[PDB]
Design a protein around this ligand. Structure first.
Ligand SMILES: C=C(O[C@H]1[C@H](O)[C@@H](CO)O[C@H](OP(=O)(O)OP(=O)(O)OC[C@H]2O[C@@H](n3ccc(=O)[nH]c3=O)[C@H](O)[C@@H]2O)[C@@H]1NC(C)=O)C(=O)O
Ligand SMILES: C=C(O[C@H]1[C@H](O)[C@@H](CO)O[C@H](OP(=O)(O)OP(=O)(O)OC[C@H]2O[C@@H](n3ccc(=O)[nH]c3=O)[C@H](O)[C@@H]2O)[C@@H]1NC(C)=O)C(=O)O
Ligand SMILES: C=C(O[C@H]1[C@H](O)[C@@H](CO)O[C@H](OP(=O)(O)OP(=O)(O)OC[C@H]2O[C@@H](n3ccc(=O)[nH]c3=O)[C@H](O)[C@@H]2O)[C@@H]1NC(C)=O)C(=O)O
Ligand SMILES: C=C(O[C@H]1[C@H](O)[C@@H](CO)O[C@H](OP(=O)(O)OP(=O)(O)OC[C@H]2O[C@@H](n3ccc(=O)[nH]c3=O)[C@H](O)[C@@H]2O)[C@@H]1NC(C)=O)C(=O)O
Ligand SMILES: *[C@](C)(OP(=O)(O)O)C(=O)O
Ligand SMILES: *[C@](C)(OP(=O)(O)O)C(=O)O
Ligand SMILES: *[C@](C)(OP(=O)(O)O)C(=O)O
Ligand SMILES: *[C@](C)(OP(=O)(O)O)C(=O)O
Ligand SMILES: [Cl-]
Ligand SMILES: [Cl-]
Ligand SMILES: [Mg+2]
Ligand SMILES: [Mg+2]
Ligand SMILES: [Mg+2]
Ligand SMILES: [Mg+2]
Lengths: 421, 421, 421, 422
């Protein structure tokens, strides 16, 4: 119903505060189930995926308490139904993150098996085999992953991920924290959300070492004592606002972030002709009104260029000077945004997993449709440098991946407004 | 929005009547814009894409005279607004078919540039380039393809398609019908709907030779007179009901159709172990209660295996004996239905354009979700064999590509029912 | 140990005669095995693959009249051995073309199963299956395809090609020419050499209709009598010399050719900036000293852009102005020539089946290596516009696909010389 | 003209063999001797043609090595004359590009022939150049040579980020940074074991390399690197090949002088195939107990994921396994030459893009085949052990480049293989 009308031309200039990592808050909220008492999770971003995670906890019997804005107190001792119903899992496949801790703490779980997702192929085979490696008897029946740990809880084991998985590493890490004995995860996801999740379990009395590297070692404990924690900054949001400034040729000082969690993104911004300055908890980018130069990029697991920034750089190459090759290795058909940009005058040829972008002088305003919680931000970025008005429909997707995108751009001098239907 | 509830286990047996081709009716209806008098189009299918095309004519000032048993009289001389609004084109990209004949008959047209489509990469550069080859000056602005022909009208020319395009051939074919001089379409699409359009334009007075081969030659004319013309049978609908019998191990006679327009589909049904007989206007498949045998297939332009039948054969391979390799060369990442079938207990490994389907003995009923007008029929087909109830949501997609799917399956003895919201 | 030493910088200018189609001569020669009397093939190109095909006839016991250069007389009635040995088949996989006619004419054959080729995936499964569909029992043993036709010869049948195959269509076409009754080749290869093969078999008394279209209906005959037929002109050779003049900015009049067998290639040369003029059997190209413009291309089955010209246009894009996207669909990783051009200063990024060629002002001479009988001609072309000398090694590959390439370039004024050792 | 291999299948393997030094570690370690200014001794070198080729490259530069003791080659780069890696040797081995980094950092300049094409797939070297340019070295590709020239005062350290994981790419910049003034930080670096072994070799010569093994390597430059005796690590690819050799035949084998931690992905896939495996400080013991292997799915990727050098070997395993398995290549998407040679031996393998859908059969049939890949062609030797009758493999000069006398080791396990010079 809600829409965003954006008038291009405006040069961005200002500073905004970054929200907590969406992909760190979800696994940490799921990790609260491992605790044996009330746990307060701070620096949460005000976006819909956090709200869907709160509903899920409601459906299970847990009643979250908001002591302050961007903060939730979770008490897992009031849990009644060990079920992640399909009515909610169908809306957010990240709900599967509850499977691991729920099985390792309470002994069983019935999580709905995720269906299809527009982005591409996103099976959860590794999530299931990882829990089986720890003795759990799992079966897919009636659309649910009916898991049940063996008597005496889960057992520690050496499990190898054939493919690097972020949420896969997270489920098995959480389960390994309460399993009996030592668990060793091989070819683990090295994303900072994983590290931030480990630091949460360790704060609670967990024995996790290796997070950040390909080999995570977990020494099981019988019970994780409650302890408060503040979620890390969102590396994707941070990057998205740096590109917003870059695309428009203006400047921005992104605050409350971390420069060490997006080296690849900052390095691509320098190749495009941007000047970057950084502090301990802030980043400052300034193009000085220069038309960027096309850059090539290849998505891959962290610390490589993240796929959640792939779309954002296509909107940069769209008005750049020269040809840029934006390649996908994670999700090879994540280019819906490209076909919407065609309407705005962007010249891009997509062949398989590669998007060849030919930079034109400027874009043209046209009504577009959002369809990806992170990639559709590129439509918001392209609209900022498009002659005329750009009406972006189906923004509920954008609301899932970004905290008040309209308000943050308005502080940077952007001419953008929300239009409720 | 409505839903479809299906109880599997029943072995289908009966006979139905095939409707008019959706992909033939769409260009044939668009082709009525070329007429210089009232034209009647028969055997139209009762599905939503046709309803959207009628609305498109409504926007342009034409008020199609619908009648009982699906017949539409169109007098294009009452046209008023030479525009195909984005509000209608965003719901169906096949609306671009009006560009060609509208530029050739009236000298100008403003048709919204199609946006993104979940299926995959579907650009329209060849549509635009083909009209540019005939002297028309085109420019993309405000999200619209603003086409203008010269004073004398469109001039015939030799145009070569770099990629085989069904709707591309149709647009350029229709434009060349009123153009001055001969036009030769090289590397043209050979689909039977292209031939059916050619024969429709010939009934109106046109002179189109070669339709159905790699080269189409058009000797342009001044005007096109009235004509009454029934469209061809739908080959995808025909193939879909043949699989419905094959998955359930039953029989089905398909009336009012044509066996010559789907030799590839019938051949893959022989490999699966199906007994097939054909007549002048009918096809009869009968599995004799046998479990299907796995089959490997590869989608390609007609007469190769059609991409619109790719999903239906995955349903067939899901309960087949052995492993089957289902490959896509047209829409490489068109496998959303595979992840929905995972919920029903199917075992399919998807890697890029290949779907390795490992057949199991039985599927399990569970709530699924449709997303593709033709491919989502596979979910209905998988539900016919699965154990228990299968609740299919978002059936408006199915209602676009198939004429009352529940009423036809009901004649074959299937437990299927429409449940409104 | 032969090598070509080219000195770049010369602007080509002249005219040359095109040889007979190499890929038409091979199957037409193989078709002579079907005959029941002396058959003479004319207009043969003097290249190694024809020599290798003649050695095979020698090993089979046939003593062909090799008096004349451009023609050969063959009497299959004097055959002594129904075998295509591994010693020869390993050097040329096109040797499999003798399988079909040998099985149909002599009731059995044992042809070595081709091994790997550095180009890409080239299995011969459609060849084996097509013969099996005609009632022939076939097994693979000792690295040989041992086929055996039933008593009364092969039976005609409807056979569907899952993938468009040139040599596949040619084998089943030849076998069906002597089979009992009608045969229907569904989704046949439309390449001009298949048409040239059909007309040859028809000249011997056969009845092959639909050659050049997607469906070929062959009515088998009992005996194929003598005929004196001249093969068609080589379309790939034509295109290579047209590019030779296009890269050097010169001109060239190609004689004894046909413009209708390479419309896709002629169209891409116009998009590059070359002025083309044609006739019944000639094609004249002239760049008039202009630097070409970058062009995109997609290889596919004829009449689409041929894969045997994909490398030739990569050298053209190297010297071109702008970025050119060269895409492969037949052999998705046939880019060895690209990595050889990096040595000559060419800026080409390769990702899967797509080559992003970024044009530069000039190439630098350096010793390179040939690996493909058709694509390595691009190394010879790049050397024409490279500064200094370019020493090409392993030219035996080029001698297979081109009739004394240096002598024809000498006619056009190119500084090219052959030096053994 | 050249050697061949004749293999008679059916024999169940049983025995033990000693693993040689890592080819891909011995190659960069030898090139790293150029950084030193003294008599550096390198032990445990494998006897394979590529080590001989690297020695020839040193000879053309004026550095003839002296063998101190068995398998211990002592190199002293102070006697170097010419700073050029000729095309005549680089065209035969593209790994020769590894001398560029150290030759530029120590001596100031270098001319290394730009490698051409490799049948395996797309293997450009743009990151090797981009990394040296990030350290101030001006480079140009003229006459087919990478004419690199460092600025006065040596190379300057820099924070270079690899857009794609490159093993040899990570090694060249690591060696260059070893002597470059200032700190160098390689981001998204290759995590392969040979990178770690190389880092420990440079540290043994007085270097300062941290984070080798992890995706972030920090290097601190020094004035010079003194002499030190060092032994190269075991070859993980050789280890895996012989573990499959025992597995395809339903037999067993103990692998000595190796390391299980350097091929976890390989050992897990063998357990999924139904192989009983035991490990220790420096050995691996596998035994199929005569059971037919189970079909397994694979996905090649940068270490520690399943290595692409082991992809071909597991196809020969699936070729005779129970069920259908998918072998996927993310690195070299068209590295399947061996598959078409396996078809000749009776294997059922459908290739589409980078996926090899292997459907297993009771057994293979012997047939003459041809090798064309220094590592992947070992699969032809493996599939020949389970092929009825004789199998004549040709162009084995490729196999000699990546394996130390493959016939004498299979003969130690009881395999009916023999080398035929005819
Ligand atoms: C799109 C989002 O961000 C995504 C982000 O794009 C991806 C990749 O960086 O990693 C997270 O997803 P994820 O954990 O489901 O994805 P991953 O598991 O890393 O998948 C990577 C690759 O591994 C494959 N994969 C994954 C899991 C599995 O069991 N098997 C498997 O084969 C997938 O096919 C995919 O191609 C983020 N989501 C969360 C909740 O952490 C989002 O916020 O929803
Ligand atoms: C999905 C539908 O059916 C589809 C059917 O799947 C396909 C393939 O057979 O051909 C029709 O689409 P279409 O005309 O857009 O498809 P094609 O034009 O043949 O596209 C084939 C390929 O060519 C490429 N392509 C197409 C047009 C173009 O200008 N440029 C281009 O590069 C596309 O990327 C695609 O990969 C049907 N639609 C209609 C209205 O005729 C539907 O009912 O909407
Ligand atoms: C390389 C040469 O030219 C080639 C030329 O590149 C191609 C494409 O037009 O068609 C001929 O090969 P071919 O007939 O072996 O190749 P095709 O059969 O067309 O193969 C096309 C595609 O179909 C697939 N294919 C073909 C046959 C088969 O049984 N199975 C199969 O999967 C292949 O994987 C390939 O990707 C020419 N050769 C001859 C002797 O006619 C040469 O000079 O030998
Ligand atoms: C085949 C051999 O082993 C190979 C082994 O297969 C590969 C992969 O693990 O890593 C080494 O090659 P390499 O270092 O040249 O390969 P990598 O640099 O890792 O290349 C991996 C991928 O990165 C890409 N790549 C690499 C470098 C570069 O500058 N740009 C680039 O795009 C390539 O296209 C390739 O697809 C081994 N060789 C040596 C001497 O260390 C051999 O012994 O020759
Ligand atoms: C993808 C984004 O999955 P999700 O919505 O997060 O469950 C989708 O549905 O498109
Ligand atoms: C695809 C299915 O195209 P269309 O609806 O026909 O415009 C989509 O939009 O998802
Ligand atoms: C390719 C070109 O196949 P062929 O020689 O024609 O059998 C090769 O072997 O390199
Ligand atoms: C590959 C293997 O590279 P190299 O020979 O090692 O330079 C090849 O040439 O095929
Ligand atoms: Cl697609
Ligand atoms: Cl590991
Ligand atoms: Mg969703
Ligand atoms: Mg739609
Ligand atoms: Mg060859
Ligand atoms: Mg080589």
């Amino acid at each position: 119903m809600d829409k965003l009308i954006i008038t291009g031309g405006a040069r961005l200039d200002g500073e905004i505060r970054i929200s907590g990592a969406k992909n760190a808050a979800l696994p940490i909220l799921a990790a609260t189930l491992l605790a044996d008492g009330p746990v307060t999770v701070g620096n949460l971003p005000h976006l819909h995926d956090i709200t869907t995670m709160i509903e899920l906890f409601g459906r299970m019997g847990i009643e979250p308490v908001i002591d302050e804005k961007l903060s939730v107190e979770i008490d897992p001792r009031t849990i009644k139904t060990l079920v992640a119903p399909y009515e909610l899992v169908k809306t957010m496949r990240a709900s599967i993150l509850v499977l691991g801790p729920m099985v390792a703490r309470f002994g069983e779980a019935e999580v709905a098996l995720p269906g299809g997702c527009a982005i591409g192929s996103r099976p959860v085979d590794l999530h299931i085999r990882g829990l089986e490696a720890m003795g759990a008897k799992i079966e897919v029946e009636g659309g649910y992953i009916k898991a049940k740990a063996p008597e005496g809880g889960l057992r520690g084991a050496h499990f190898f991920f054939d493919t690097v998985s972020v949420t896969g590493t997270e489920n098995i890490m959480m389960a390994a924290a309460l399993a009996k004995g030592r668990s060793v995860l091989q070819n683990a996801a090295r994303e900072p959300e994983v590290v931030d999740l480990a630091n949460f379990i360790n704060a609670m009395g967990g024995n996790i070492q290796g997070a950040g590297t390909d080999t995570i070692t977990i020494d099981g404990v019988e019970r994780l004592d409650s302890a408060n924690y503040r979620v890390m900054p969102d590396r994707i949001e941070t990057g998205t606002y740096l590109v917003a400034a870059a695309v428009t040729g203006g400047r921005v000082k992104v605050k409350d972030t971390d420069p060490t969690i997006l080296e690849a993104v900052l390095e691509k911004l320098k190749e495009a002709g941007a000047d970057i300055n950084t502090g301990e908890d802030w980043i400052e980018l300034d193009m000085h009104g220069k038309r960027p130069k096309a850059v090539n990029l290849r998505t891959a697991p962290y610390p490589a260029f993240p796929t959640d920034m792939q779309a954002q750089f296509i909107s940069l190459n769209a008005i750049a000077e020269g040809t840029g090759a934006v390649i996908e290795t994670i999700f090879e058909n994540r280019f819906m945004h490209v076909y919407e940009m065609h309407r705005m005058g962007a010249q891009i040829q997509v062949e398989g997993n590669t998007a060849i972008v030919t930079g034109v002088k400027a874009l043209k305003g046209a009504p577009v449709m959002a369809t990806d919680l992170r990639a559709s931000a590129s439509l918001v970025l392209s609209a900022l440098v498009a002659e005329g008005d750009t009406l972006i429909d189906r923004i509920y997707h954008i609301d899932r991946g970004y905290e008040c995108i309209e308000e943050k751009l308005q502080m940077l001098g952007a001419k953008i407004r929300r239009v409720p239907g």
